[PDB]
Amino acid sequence: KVYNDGYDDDNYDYIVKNGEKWMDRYEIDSLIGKGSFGQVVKAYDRVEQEWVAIKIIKNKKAFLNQAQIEVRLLELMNKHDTEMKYYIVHLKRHFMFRNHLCLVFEMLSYNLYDLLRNTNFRGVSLNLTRKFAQQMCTALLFLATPELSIIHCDLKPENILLCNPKRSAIKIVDFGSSCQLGQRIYQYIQSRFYRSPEVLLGMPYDLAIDMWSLGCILVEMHTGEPLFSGANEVDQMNKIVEVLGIPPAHILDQAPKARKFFEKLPDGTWNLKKEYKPPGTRKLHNILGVETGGPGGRRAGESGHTVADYLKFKDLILRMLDYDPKTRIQPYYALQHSFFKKT
């Protein structure tokens, strides 16, 4: 059985060969990442005399077209940040090779899920969480500039990569599921643990969905575990409610999917449909360990983890987890918050 004249496997992927030369330019070294889209290889660019990462898209029309959207968004973004100061991965060029679209990037290190694994799922320090938070908010401020207006739509630890294994600098990757404010098309978006209430409820959405995901990500980076680990959409909404209470009535009264999760009382108030902790009783104050030595008590007696530090982090996270997307904190104001260092 032969796929793509022998070049592909039965998964639509290119069969990588160590040392292969492409186009009198690139020498392929080895596989360094993989996912639903295809593969990422380390390769030497002999023209520019540098190592690069090549994202080799599957040879299949749905995967090709997803990547063509990504290329257009990257070309728009990189063009408005030629100094590469806004924390988005740099697309150098693209080409078609043996029926695969190939995207050439600067080469990065480990992703933030890999980093959590390296902590044995116990979390990184509050100081490193703060560095990651400040860079992510800067990236979201850039995506919100009007000529872009880009919603990433799939933020999670595995889509944030370190630049270098010994340093805190990061870049955001994977714009294949992204869209622009003026061209919103998708009803079903965001990976479940990081999915915003407005999406769960079938309501209109905007760039605020990415700020919701960021709040969830930052808690998990410090505790080691996902904040809201639902098995399905009903479980996901119930896990959100355990921490944050019943959503406001002004929201539920306008939500097409309200009755998937809630019921309206004669009061006019809303409650859950019929095992969970009562609404709002799983306090973020206790998940973080504000007054009890951090997650698991493991930060007791460590510098950089005072009660005061934890109260500032809690305040910022609760603003990122506002149920109302009109009042949820926006990137400009997140960057001004006293959790961040002045200079």
Ligand X SMILES: CN(C)c1nccc(-c2cnn3ncccc23)n1
Q: Name the segment binding ligand X (CB under 6 A); options: 14-22, 104-112, 124-132, 207-215.
A: 104-112
Q: Which amino acid is at 240?
A: I
33 labelled as ligand-binding?
yes
The residues after which the chain has a C–N gap greater than 2.5 Å are 274
Which among 8, 154, 174, 322 is annotated as catalytic? Answer: 154
Exactly one of 3, 33, 287, 311 binds ligand X (CB under 6 A); that residue is 33
Exactly one of 28, 104, 108, 139 binds ligand X (CB under 6 A); that residue is 108
Nearer to ligand X, 55 or 130 (CB): 55
30 labelled as ligand-binding?
no
| Residue 32 lies near ligand X (rule: CB under 6 A) | yes
**How far is residue 250's CA from residue 326's CA, in Å, rounded to a whole number?**
12
Q: How far is CA 63 from the centre of its chain?
A: 20
297 labelled as ligand-binding?
no
- Residues contacting ligand X: total by CB under 6 A: 12
**How far is residue 126's CA from residue 302's CA, in Å, rounded to a whole number?**
11
Nearer to ligand X, 22 or 113 (CB): 113
Nearer to ligand X, 51 or 333 (CB): 51
**How far is residue 49's CA from residue 18's CA, in Å, rounded to a whole number?**
19
Q: Binding string, 34-63, against ligand X, x = CB under 6 A?
A: -x----x------------x-x--------
Nearer to ligand X, 52 or 318 (CB): 52
User: Which among 93, 87, 126 has a CA at the least distance from the CA of 298?
Assistant: 126
**How far is residue 72's CA from residue 70's CA, in Å, rounded to a whole number?**
5
Instruction: Give residues 173-232 in contact with ligand X (rule: CB under 6 A).
Output: 173-174
Token reading at 111: 């992703």
154 catalytic per annotation: yes
**How far is residue 160's CA from residue 146's CA, in Å, rounded to a whole number?**
23
Calculate Rg over the CA atoms of the chain.
Answer: 22
Residues carrying an active site annotation: 154
Residues that bind ligand X (CB under 6 A): 32-33, 35, 40, 53, 55, 89, 105, 107-108, 173-174
